[PDB]
Amino acid sequence: STTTNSNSIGRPNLVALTRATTKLIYSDIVATQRTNQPVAAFYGIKYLNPDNE
Amino acid sequence: AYSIELTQDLRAVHGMDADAELSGILATEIMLEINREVVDWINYSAQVGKS
């Protein structure tokens, strides 16, 4: 009685591949504007009182 | 032996080509030295004049 014990399996079917990578949030979290020079100078400009606060 | 982080700096800030600047000073240096050689084998190999 030939059964699946006689038959020999050549290869597995590849089915599914999985690479585990985080949902990556640097895009939503931080305010990004590319810099065209190796040093990046953000101004910030403060509207004061006569008391400087 | 110029850094890979240099060219990007120097392309961005100065617009110069990095590589093509070193290839500028090496290609010029050898032809300046090979030329400083023969002038220095003329003044080396020349007899003393006014003698």
From Swiss-Prot, chain A:
Domain of life: Viruses
UniProt PTM comment: Proteolytic cleavage at the N-terminus by the prohead core protein protease gives rise to the mature capsid vertex protein.
Quaternary context: Homopentamer. Interacts with the portal protein. Interacts with the major capsid protein that forms 160 hexamers.
Family listed: Belongs to the Tevenvirinae capsid vertex family.
Job of this protein: Capsid protein that self-associates to form pentons, building the capsid in association with hexamers of the major capsid protein and one dodecamer of the portal protein. The capsid vertex protein self-associates to form 11 pentons, building the T=13 laevo capsid in association with 160 hexamers of the major capsid protein.
Protein name: Capsid vertex protein
Naturally occurring in which organism (per UniProt): Enterobacteria phage T4 (Bacteriophage T4)
Lineage: Viruses, Duplodnaviria, Heunggongvirae, Uroviricota, Caudoviricetes
Full-protein positions shown: 11 to 63 of 427
Curated annotation (Swiss-Prot), chain B:
Transmembrane annotation, as ranges: none
Residue runs in coiled coils: none
Posttranslational modification: A proteolytic cleavage by the prohead core protein protease gives rise to the mature major capsid protein during virus maturation.
Assembly information from the UniProt record: Homohexamer. Interacts with the portal protein. Interacts with the capsid vertex protein that forms pentamers. Interacts with hoc; one hoc molecule associates with each capsid hexamer. Interacts with soc; this interaction reinforces the capsid structure. A total of 960 subunits of the major capsid protein forms the 160 hexamers.
Function: Major capsid protein that self-associates to form hexamers, building most of the capsid in association with pentons made of the capsid vertex protein and one dodecamer of the portal protein. The major capsid protein self-associates to form 160 hexamers, building most of the T=13 laevo capsid. Folding of major capsid protein requires the assistance of two chaperones, the host chaperone groL acting with the phage encoded gp23-specific chaperone, gp31. The capsid also contains two nonessential outer capsid proteins, Hoc and Soc, which decorate the capsid surface.
Family stated for the protein in its record: Belongs to the Tevenvirinae major capsid protein family.
Descriptive protein name: Major capsid protein
From-to range in the entire protein, with total length: 269 to 319 of 521
